[PDB]
Design a protein around this ligand. Structure first.
Ligand SMILES: OC[C@H]1O[C@H](O[C@H]2[C@H](O)[C@@H](O)[C@@H](O[C@H]3[C@H](O)[C@@H](O)[C@@H](O[C@H]4[C@H](O)[C@@H](O)[C@@H](O[C@H]5[C@H](O)[C@@H](O)[C@@H](O)O[C@@H]5CO)O[C@@H]4CO)O[C@@H]3CO)O[C@@H]2CO)[C@H](O)[C@@H](O)[C@@H]1O
Ligand code: ZN
Ligand code: ZN
Lengths: 134, 383
């Protein structure tokens, strides 16, 4: 199978994150350098169309994420219930911020537990909110 | 207001035999005392998931089966539990159309496929190929007529040509649809849609033609051919046009491949009348007399009930319907179907009007049809 993360894609292409030219899977526009770095920091996955690798630009990521939330929101749970459902601590679960898509840190997940803030399920994806997205 | 206990409210599309269905409801009420109200709201298939999500809506919703997986995924449909004796009364392939995640989510009613409908007085020998249409249209324009008019606003009607040389929605293998393998922007889809656009460029069709325009023109004897389903036949009858129903033209020697719909009846998960709805559907509608009452209003097509279909199959129009069906494909019922249709709708309208090239229109539709799946991958949990 093909590289799903930017570093492995960079290694296969013998390039670096500073140099790689990526296009958005949706709009096919070239990502700004800032968007390449953000893609890596948010731990997003390279997607393949017609055998070619693509990332995503910020405009399309926000557009389709907002659509997905507005159409496919399901229900919410407290963190302890997630831990019982999956039989794992929150630190071992991938829970992205609903606003910025970054995976939540363990401290942000513990903050949800302490402050009685529920996590939300959108299309089987569990989401919270990082600190920045207050 | 909330769904009323002790009555049945039914939604069915305005192109179906809703007056005939109301007659079945009248019989139900005569026998049982339970009133049945049949409504045909606009955009019922979009209204249903909205109102049913709040616990409201009709007790029973009719639509082709392609919408029902999305409803079931959202928990809006009751599971249906026909006994084995009842299941045996309907064709197995119709039950499969309404089977989602291994469970039956609706009752199948009738099998629909598009056919070529032609005016025998204007055109005794209809064309076997799409490629013949341009020359035939030039000939008919010289007589003050035209060759072909059909709805270009709904992708259901243009899909048979798009699919002919290789277009597809989702690849089907191992009894399963691969949502990651979409066939909207492949060379076969482009070839078919290019042929359609060329018909428009060359003044053999108009991009603005819709259902009403094509129906009026055919039923007035102004155009020699149309493409439509069985529900359209009774208006042609009353128009006194001498028409035939036949196999769709081939494209590049390949059959046109209509998407086959099974008109199906689902029970709202929020209905307090699930038992009455089952009694109505199994023991009043899905009988020879019940289906005949609907069919006499607007023809249903090839009904799911074997006993009645054995009579209808003797009608050459039904034989043609099933010939086209067998050359086409059963629509997926998966939740991704609606996004597929909205995406293809835009592609055909934009290409037909020249707003986009065929290539750009279909490239965008391929992406749009796959958009939620792409997002699931982007946000996925991978190494
Ligand atoms: O607002 C902008 C836009 O609105 C109007 O178009 C919209 C329609 O009014 C609306 O119903 C909706 O259409 C979707 C539909 O929701 C979706 O399910 C899908 O439809 C499929 C069917 O599911 C499928 O079964 C099949 O339908 C056949 C049917 O089986 C047969 O029995 C008979 O009834 O003919 C039907 C075909 O007409 O095929 C259709 C696909 O053709 O896709 C539809 C979209 O194509 O959304 C429409 C777009 O918003 C206005 O008409 C339009 O002018 C406006 O621009
Ligand atoms: Zn983009
Ligand atoms: Zn955030």
């Amino acid at each position: 199978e093909r590289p799903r993360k930017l570093p492995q894609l960079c290694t296969e292409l013998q390039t670096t994150i500073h140099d790689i030219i990526l296009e958005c899977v949706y709009c096919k526009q070239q990502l700004l350098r800032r968007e390449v770095y953000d893609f890596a920091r948010r731990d997003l996955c390279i997607v393949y169309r017609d055998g070619n690798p693509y990332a995503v630009c910020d405009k399309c990521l926000k557009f389709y994420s907002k659509i997905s939330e507005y159409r496919h929101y399901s229900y919410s749970l407290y963190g302890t219930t997630l831990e019982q459902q999956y039989n794992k601590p929150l630190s071992d679960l991938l829970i992205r911020c609903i606003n910025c898509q970054k995976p939540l840190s363990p401290e942000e997940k513990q903050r949800h537990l302490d402050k009685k803030q529920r996590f939300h399920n959108i299309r089987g994806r569990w989401t919270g909110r990082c600190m920045s997205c207050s | 207001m909330k769904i009323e206990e002790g009555k049945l409210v039914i939604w069915i599309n305005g192109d179906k035999g809703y007056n005939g269905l109301a007659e079945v409801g009248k019989k139900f009420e005569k026998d049982t005392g339970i009133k049945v109200t049949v409504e045909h709201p606009d955009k019922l298939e979009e209204k249903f998931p909205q109102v049913a999500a709040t616990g409201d809506g009709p007790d029973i919703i009719f639509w082709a089966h392609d919408r029902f997986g999305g409803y079931a995924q959202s928990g809006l449909l009751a599971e249906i539990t026909p006994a084995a004796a009842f299941q045996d009364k309907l064709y197995p392939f119709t039950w499969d159309a309404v089977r989602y995640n291994g469970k039956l989510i609706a009752y199948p009613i009738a099998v629909e496929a598009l056919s070529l409908i032609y005016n025998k007085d204007l055109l005794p020998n209809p064309p076997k190929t799409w490629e013949e249409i341009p020359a035939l249209d030039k000939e008919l324009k010289a007589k003050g007529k035209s060759a072909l008019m059909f709805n270009l606003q709904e992708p259901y009607f243009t899909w048979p040509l798009i699919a002919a040389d290789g277009g597809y929605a989702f690849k089907y293998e191992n009894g399963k649809y691969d949502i990651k393998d979409v066939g909207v922007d492949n060379a076969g889809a482009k070839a078919g849609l290019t042929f359609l656009v060329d018909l428009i460029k060359n003044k053999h069709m108009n991009a603005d033609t819709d259902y009403s325009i094509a129906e009026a023109a055919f039923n007035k004897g102004e155009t020699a051919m149309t493409i439509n389903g069985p529900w359209a036949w009774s208006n042609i009858d009353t128009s006194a046009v001498n028409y035939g129903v036949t196999v769709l033209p081939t494209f590049k020697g390949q059959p046109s491949k209509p998407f086959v719909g099974v008109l199906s009846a689902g029970i709202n998960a929020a209905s307090p009348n699930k038992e009455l709805a089952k009694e109505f559907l199994e023991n009043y509608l899905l009988t020879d007399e019940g289906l005949e009452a609907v069919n006499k209003d607007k023809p249903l097509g090839a009904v799911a009930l074997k006993s009645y279909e054995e009579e209808l199959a003797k009608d050459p129009r039904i034989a043609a319907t099933m010939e086209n069906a067998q050359k086409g494909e059963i629509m997926p019922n998966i939740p991704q179907m609606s996004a597929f249709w909205y995406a293809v709708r835009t592609a055909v309208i934009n290409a037909a009007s020249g707003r986009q090239t065929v290539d750009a229109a279909l490239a965008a539709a391929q992406t749009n049809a796959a958009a939620e799946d792409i997002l699931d991958e982007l946000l996925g949990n991978m190494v």
